[PDB]
Amino acid sequence: SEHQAIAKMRTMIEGFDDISHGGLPIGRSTLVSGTSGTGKTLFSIQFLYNGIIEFDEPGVFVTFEETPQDIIKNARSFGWDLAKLVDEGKLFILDASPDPEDLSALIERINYAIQKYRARRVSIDSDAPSVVRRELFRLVARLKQIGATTVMTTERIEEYGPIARYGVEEFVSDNVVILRNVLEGERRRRTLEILKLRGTSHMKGEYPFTITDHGINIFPLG
Amino acid sequence: AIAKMRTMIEGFDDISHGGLPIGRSTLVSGTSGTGKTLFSIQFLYNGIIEFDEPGVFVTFEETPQDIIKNARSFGWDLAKLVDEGKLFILDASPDPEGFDLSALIERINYAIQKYRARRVSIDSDAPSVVRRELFRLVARLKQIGATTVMTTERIEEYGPIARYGVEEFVSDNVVILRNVLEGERRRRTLEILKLRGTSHMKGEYPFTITDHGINIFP
Amino acid sequence: AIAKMRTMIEGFDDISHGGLPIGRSTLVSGTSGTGKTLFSIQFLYNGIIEFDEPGVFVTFEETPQDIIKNARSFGWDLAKLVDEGKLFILDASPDFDLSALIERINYAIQKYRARRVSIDSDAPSVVRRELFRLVARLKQIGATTVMTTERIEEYGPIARYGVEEFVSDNVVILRNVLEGERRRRTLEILKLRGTSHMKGEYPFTITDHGINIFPL
Amino acid sequence: HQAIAKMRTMIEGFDDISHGGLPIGRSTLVSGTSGTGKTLFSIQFLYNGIIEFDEPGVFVTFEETPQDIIKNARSFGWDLAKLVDEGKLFILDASPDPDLSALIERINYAIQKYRARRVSIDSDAPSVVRRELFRLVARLKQIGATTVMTTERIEEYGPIARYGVEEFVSDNVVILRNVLEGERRRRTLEILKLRGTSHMKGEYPFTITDHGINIFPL
Amino acid sequence: QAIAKMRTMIEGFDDISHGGLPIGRSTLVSGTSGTGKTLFSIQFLYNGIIEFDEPGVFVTFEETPQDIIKNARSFGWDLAKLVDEGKLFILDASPDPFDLSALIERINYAIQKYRARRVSIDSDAPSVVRRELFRLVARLKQIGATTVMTTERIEEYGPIARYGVEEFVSDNVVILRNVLEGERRRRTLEILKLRGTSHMKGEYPFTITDHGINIFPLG
Amino acid sequence: EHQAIAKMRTMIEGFDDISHGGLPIGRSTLVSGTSGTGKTLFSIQFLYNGIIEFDEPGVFVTFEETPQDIIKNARSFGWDLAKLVDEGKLFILDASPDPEFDLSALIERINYAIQKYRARRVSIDSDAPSVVRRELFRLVARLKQIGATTVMTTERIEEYGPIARYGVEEFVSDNVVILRNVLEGERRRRTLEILKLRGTSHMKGEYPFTITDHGINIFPL
């Protein structure tokens, strides 16, 4: 797949690089939306982990809720030692999680981390729609200027309803991935869809995946 | 990887691949009469009986006397467990005559140390406020090291996980109890929707409530 | 294991495995004309006639006179029970208001030595708060209470404000379901805290003798 | 066993469905979507009282003018103008020019003036609508009027009326439907509720023809 | 002395309505986008002029007269000629790229000026909308106009019009639908209600042709 | 004039058949769709074909995507827009947000570009409904005065719900096209529908299409 306009970097997540016809568009952001426990955080961690392990590309993980400590503990579920990557300066977890007890400043923290750690991959996890739209638009634009390739996760509450919470997120993003966890006849089945990738082709519709001891495994069928 | 403690609730430790994640909170959501209080009581009762692990039950609606009375239908002598100092029922109900999260936490905390409890149950208007408040309760409980069941309400069997559409997102673990109409009959089911950082069986599993509490069939 | 009082409403004590738990409140919710008031009235009437248990009926909209006139069609003479001091109808109907209501209810309960209470018919937090306090106080008093509420759909929320079923000990749902062009009445005990009951919907009719439920 | 007395509408089929007609001294809510026959039912009620039983009636209108009411009733061969001339029908015009306490006095005055037994009324907090409609029902009750009051609704199988409260404050509720299925319309009438008395249940098909409403109980 | 009807001469419609539109009254014609509302209102005036020499007033609130005229040439109708002959007046109430009373006075003036028998009107609180519409309807009735007034709706099988009140202050209601099923569109017309008179019930299929609306028998 | 409205060919395969000749001249066509339905692609292909096939210059007005991304992404369809910009055949007007709105002023700037580049085709890409309606009405009217033939895209959130976002856009527009991206049985199917063209005829309902290395391809029948 060399005849496409947009250079892509490989997630090395089994099956995803096939669905995306080469990986995530470089220097752009990809929205990854899903209901609770669909694998958003896992996808964003796996993106960073693979970048470090496979290509020695440093990553920055920005967390807004889960603590770094819990992110690290949970990744051990997959045999990933993120503490060691942090110790080696290859992974930086930026803690923006609220005190257990603005955006401008946040963006500067991110930029600082990206420069300090030489980061090539970024993951960001995770009331007026128009305000959300402009703020997200601003975040996306700043990351692009910096040159980062970014996964940003968002929540949604229905498997076949709005893409994210505010009805605007999918429109200001260059790339949109939807993780679903569909309940039918009392069974759950996980799927991944690439809804859009601006300027390039991709496989369409839903593709099954599982979450196992090895992380996400996606199965393309086309 | 995260360790789990056995609930000894029949069938549940299979569905959860070992029980509830230790040192974390598990959200248990369901419409009215789905078995939420029962699940949270059975969690502490089995902790005491099977493992000599004391428990703290935090009630916001039902009086301790009613919690005790309602458990007799299952042959659980909760009055005896309270008399022995193995179960503490913390009453946080608003007295019909005459909210601060930080006070509750300290009371829970001292109860935990006083009774040397390993297991806690908590039973049970801006979504953004709810989200932040729940996030703080979960964090503070985690800081104490308590393994906690916390129940919440929902109003549809196949709609939102909880009431404000945010509860499942700040919870580490989520269990849904349903009570579904099948023709004119009801069918109860239990689902483990998610457990962060660990594995579990997927989808719904039928259960019944009997004289011995919750009985699940994987 | 918990003591129940018999409603003597045909079929209902079978569905509730012996009647309504004594000293607790039971929510009875339904759309319009589902039989809520009838259930409430029958609960008190049977208590008086069969068990000499006095009752207090609390009405918020229907006048005492219409309550009495409507019951008359079931052959139930409520005016006579009121005359004998076995029934008190408390008129709360229009031209903490709650605390004033509670005190009035308490007084009637003490005065008439009532064992049974029926209460016939905005922000969720406020509703939940007020209702919880009403229920808690009746419990302290030791009343066994039927509390009716409205709902607007047969298979939607239990009651109007989405909280009523969560603060009640017991929940009964009266439905009047349209199937094709025919109506079918059903009763369901959704929940009885601390005890067993039959599950799901059971058909009933309303006749000259009141509610008649068939649980088999 | 003392029955609720009823007065016959002589609307064909309806006195079978209602087991004798409308409850005397009370108000019956007649609700439906646009063009379901609400006004027709309310007029046929008054017209039949006058012609069959020599019971005069008051028609209270809030939007259609008297002249249009009269004009439209000509469709069915009824001469309302003549009945107004004879003092047997009074159309009370409460329609706006291109409050409730005042209206009630107006209606009471008209009832007393014309020996009227039958009244038809044709036709934003839900809480205030509820309390206001309640008062209207109550004062009509004291006068001893037997009243048809129409309301609008916007869905064939949605709320009984517009504000989700009107059915709960009415003693009696009739629903007129105009159901669209597979490009064809079907008129049905349902008596949902009559407090204190019996009635047939569910929907009964009807047509509107040159003779007004014809209901088919079989 | 039941209410009489004026023929629309719209193929199929006068059968459905058992004679046409009730004279001296207003008929609501509601529909989703591109359902044929303007076409119906224009064809009503056009046929009145061509068949009965009854002059018409068309009141436009968005579309310019120029575009109304231009679009009607799709059907082989020369509205510019009819305006020039004084048979039709297109009253421009469209805004430059609200007082209902003033509008009503302009419509009355036009009806008197052109001796019009036929009028088409194309096209925040419901209580306000209800009151204003009722006023407009009442005033057109006192004038003696037979009126078609179009309204928008956003669902094919949802409310009649946008505010949930328009169908209740209208004497007459026609619904145009453009139903999408299995990737194909089907146009239908329904007479929902005609106060004080009879009409056929349910949906009737129609097409928009080079010569305007054609309505066919059920099915 | 005395003729029914004339149309300009889009040369988008299959579309000029569906529209019986192309887009109505001197008017605006709304093109609405959920995310990634091909709205920007449709609006670019309209300008691109105008330039290449008829030497009709074009103005593209972008409200969020930067000109440089518009140009970069169009390379996916084999089009060199930078070359067209260099030759003065295409002008991309950047109305996108400074990362850290007066439609009347914007309209005048669109007019400058239209007059400067002698453009015949315009594409515009892409919360009180009364306010939306009035502003959209004024934009449509001013474009019609200028005489431009315009594609304007809008967003929608459901495949079979509202045409656009505010329930008014499809009513003030002369022409409406809906792009859908329907998910059934885990597969997506793209369709195009011409819902309405005031004053002229068109085929009805949905027609399937794909996006290829040569742009939009609407299947026959």
Ligand SMILES: Nc1ncnc2c1ncn2[C@@H]1O[C@H](COP(=O)(O)OP(=O)(O)OP(O)(O)=S)[C@@H](O)[C@H]1O
């Ligand atoms: N070793 C494992 N084997 C199988 N499944 C696992 C394993 N570890 C974790 N999981 C699953 O992965 C899910 C967690 O995925 P996450 O990426 O944390 O979800 P999420 O979409 O970020 O959800 P939130 O943030 O809690 S709403 C758990 O709910 C389990 O189903």
Ligand SMILES: Nc1ncnc2c1ncn2[C@@H]1O[C@H](COP(=O)(O)OP(=O)(O)OP(O)(O)=S)[C@@H](O)[C@H]1O
């Ligand atoms: N060479 C290609 N072959 C096949 N599909 C392609 C190709 N290039 C792009 N696409 C598709 O075109 C889509 C982008 O189309 P656009 O016109 O940008 O959609 P859009 O409706 O404008 O979406 P927005 O503005 O991001 S909401 C991508 O999501 C791909 O699916």
Ligand SMILES: Nc1ncnc2c1ncn2[C@@H]1O[C@H](COP(=O)(O)OP(=O)(O)OP(O)(O)=S)[C@@H](O)[C@H]1O
């Ligand atoms: N001995 C028993 N046998 C069978 N079912 C029982 C028995 N005891 C209780 N139950 C059932 O258990 C239900 C009570 O379960 P709970 O755990 O109190 O429900 P809950 O979900 O907490 O409901 P709330 O708090 O009132 S909304 C009752 O409604 C009965 O159906």
Ligand SMILES: Nc1ncnc2c1ncn2[C@@H]1O[C@H](COP(=O)(O)OP(=O)(O)OP(O)(O)=S)[C@@H](O)[C@H]1O
């Ligand atoms: N003698 C009777 N025989 C048969 N059915 C009767 C008789 N009396 C009343 N009914 C029925 O009982 C219904 C009234 O039941 P209620 O208990 O008053 O209803 P409800 O749920 O309280 O309704 P509200 O308060 O008006 S919303 C009537 O609508 C009839 O269908």
Ligand SMILES: Nc1ncnc2c1ncn2[C@@H]1O[C@H](COP(=O)(O)OP(=O)(O)OP(O)(O)=S)[C@@H](O)[C@H]1O
């Ligand atoms: N002679 C007739 N033959 C058959 N149907 C008729 C005849 N006269 C009137 N109708 C029908 O009766 C309907 C009018 O009934 P109404 O009682 O005015 O309805 P409505 O429910 O009061 O509607 P509103 O007030 O306009 S919302 C018309 O729409 C016709 O369908």
Ligand SMILES: Nc1ncnc2c1ncn2[C@@H]1O[C@H](COP(=O)(O)OP(=O)(O)OP(O)(O)=S)[C@@H](O)[C@H]1O
């Ligand atoms: N010659 C023609 N042959 C066939 N159909 C035509 C012809 N001319 C126009 N049409 C159709 O008529 C429709 C326009 O009808 P209108 O009366 O303008 O609809 P409308 O309901 O008023 O839409 P608005 O006002 O834009 S929401 C177009 O969308 C075409 O489908």
Ligand SMILES: [Cl-]
């Ligand atoms: Cl899985």
Ligand SMILES: [Cl-]
């Ligand atoms: Cl059970």
Ligand SMILES: [Cl-]
């Ligand atoms: Cl019955």
Ligand SMILES: [Cl-]
């Ligand atoms: Cl009919």
Ligand SMILES: [Cl-]
């Ligand atoms: Cl057609």
Ligand SMILES: [Cl-]
């Ligand atoms: Cl495609």
Ligand SMILES: [Mg+2]
């Ligand atoms: Mg996560």
Ligand SMILES: [Mg+2]
């Ligand atoms: Mg409980």
Ligand SMILES: [Mg+2]
């Ligand atoms: Mg009642």
Ligand SMILES: [Mg+2]
């Ligand atoms: Mg009427």
